[PDB]
Amino acid sequence: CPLMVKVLDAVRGSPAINVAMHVFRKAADDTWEPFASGKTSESGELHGLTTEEEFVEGIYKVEIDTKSYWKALGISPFHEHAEVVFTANDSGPRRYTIAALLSPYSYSTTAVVTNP
Amino acid sequence: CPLMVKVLDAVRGSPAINVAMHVFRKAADDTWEPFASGKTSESGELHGLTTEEEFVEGIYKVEIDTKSYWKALGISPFHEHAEVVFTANDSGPRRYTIAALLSPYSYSTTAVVTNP
Amino acid sequence: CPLMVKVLDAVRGSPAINVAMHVFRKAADDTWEPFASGKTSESGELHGLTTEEEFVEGIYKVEIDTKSYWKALGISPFHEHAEVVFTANDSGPRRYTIAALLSPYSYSTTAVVTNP
Amino acid sequence: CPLMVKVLDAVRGSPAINVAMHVFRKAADDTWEPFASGKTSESGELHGLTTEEEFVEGIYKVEIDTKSYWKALGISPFHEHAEVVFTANDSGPRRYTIAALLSPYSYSTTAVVTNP
Ligand SMILES: Cc1cc(OCC(=O)O)cc(C)c1Cc1ccc(O)c(Cc2ccccc2)c1
Ligand SMILES: Cc1cc(OCC(=O)O)cc(C)c1Cc1ccc(O)c(Cc2ccccc2)c1
Numbered sequence A, B, C, D: 001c002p003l004m005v006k007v008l009d010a011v012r013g014s015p016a017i018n019v020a021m022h023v024f025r026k027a028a029d030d031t032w033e034p035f036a037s038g039k040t041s042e043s044g045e046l047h048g049l050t051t052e053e054e055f056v057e058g059i060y061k062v063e064i065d066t067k068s069y070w071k072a073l074g075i076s077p078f079h080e081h082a083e084v085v086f087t088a089n090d091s092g093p094r095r096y097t098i099a100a101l102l103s104p105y106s107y108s109t110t111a112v113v114t115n116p
Helices: A066-072 B066-072 C066-072 D066-072
Strands: A003-009 A020-026 A032-039 A058-064 A082-088 A095-103 A106-114 B003-009 B020-026 B032-039 B058-064 B082-088 B095-103 B106-114 C003-009 C020-026 C032-039 C058-064 C082-088 C095-103 C106-114 D003-009 D020-026 D032-039 D058-064 D082-088 D095-103 D106-114
Touching: A003 A058, A066 A095, A082 A095, A082 A106, A082 B082, B003 B058, B066 B095, B082 B095, B082 B106, C003 C058, C066 C095, C082 C095, C082 C106, C082 D082, D003 D058, D066 D095, D082 D095, D082 D106
Parallel strands: A003 A095, B003 B095, C003 C095, D003 D095
Antiparallel strands: A020 A032, A020 A058, A058 A082, A095 A106, A106 B106, B020 B032, B020 B058, B058 B082, B095 B106, C020 C032, C020 C058, C058 C082, C095 C106, C106 D106, D020 D032, D020 D058, D058 D082, D095 D106
């Protein structure tokens, strides 16, 4: 996987399961073009969003539907969603893991970038 | 002062000074309208973005220009920016502090919401 | 005021109020001597732990009683406490703010160190 | 593994490699008895610290030598180490992943607790 997302839940102490997210690439006219999506597995992971050949340089956005997640748990959340916006592959193809830790009024996101 | 933003630098253990950010409000037609902007002070704070009367119910986005902050320090960070998107004043007027902690490959955001 | 602690609750989006904590200093014989203690205010802050004259060079530990905080809210959290252990004033007197963000299964801590 | 530790580096955007840590169990006299240790792999992971039979109820401390890690990178750190103190297995055996995200002046720790 050139791109993987891992989401944890800081209230339950667990992977965050069935969290939906969409991935966008910024177009030449500065709009966001959606191109992939999925929901996290029982281990809080989403794999298989893109392939090496398709995942060219550019600016990418991952929009994580954290609000639906907290709603499903009966917990009032602050954010509409969690975004991660980044330039990919600036100096060549990299493997990216986006890690997110969710609380109702806070989130953190981190990137693990490895050169395959 | 109903909306304040505080930004810290996790590398230097300091306020993040001179960090630009723009606030937007979602309009009735669903586009992001410019709402306010400013840069953090020497204490990493930005106050005076809005007033109670102007800060009506709605979905607000704060886009924090973290990339320029890192680039000015010589660092090429992962994120293009840090976004915070939230519904405000859904249950009457509240005071919001958005707190952000910055590292080159990670950021966290939290909200303190108080009732005046 | 050379040492201040600020504690936020990531579940409620509020200061963490009435959080007890104890500060220790490592002694010449390597044991932890009691240094100061207190509980956070309604603003999640604890000030007045020490003075510039008393806060000499050394290794200090702040043990924050996060378990009691969660238990009083009905929650059985993961951590017994949050610890912050650091060398202080190694390069002359500094002002330290210890910031902690709490969730039932996670906590984060950061330091803001300023030169007066 | 009943106990795994995963450490990431928020400055380099990578697993935190060759981070040493020690694990202690609290004794009846309230002292900490060390019983396991290791250093993180190239993927920032430490496995094999204990076995199901040995990992009985009690209070456990993981002391992560973050200071040596930052020193090895030529970066000035704030903390002496990062601690994680928790009661294990309170309601039966669980699998524990302790996740830590490191910055020079901040760290976060989270637990993923799964029932095997
Ligand atoms: C626990 C784990 C399993 C995991 O499995 C997938 C794999 O091994 O590739 C991957 C990662 C990066 C992790 C670590 C992790 C997950 C979410 C996350 O936000 C972080 C960073 C973090 C850690 C502690 C507190 C706040 C943030 C690490
Ligand atoms: C909101 C605030 C009020 C505050 O009042 C006291 C003062 O102004 O000195 C001080 C600080 C450092 C803060 C910011 C703050 C509080 C806790 C805390 O963990 C952090 C770092 C952080 C920020 C976002 C997500 C995780 C961690 C900052």
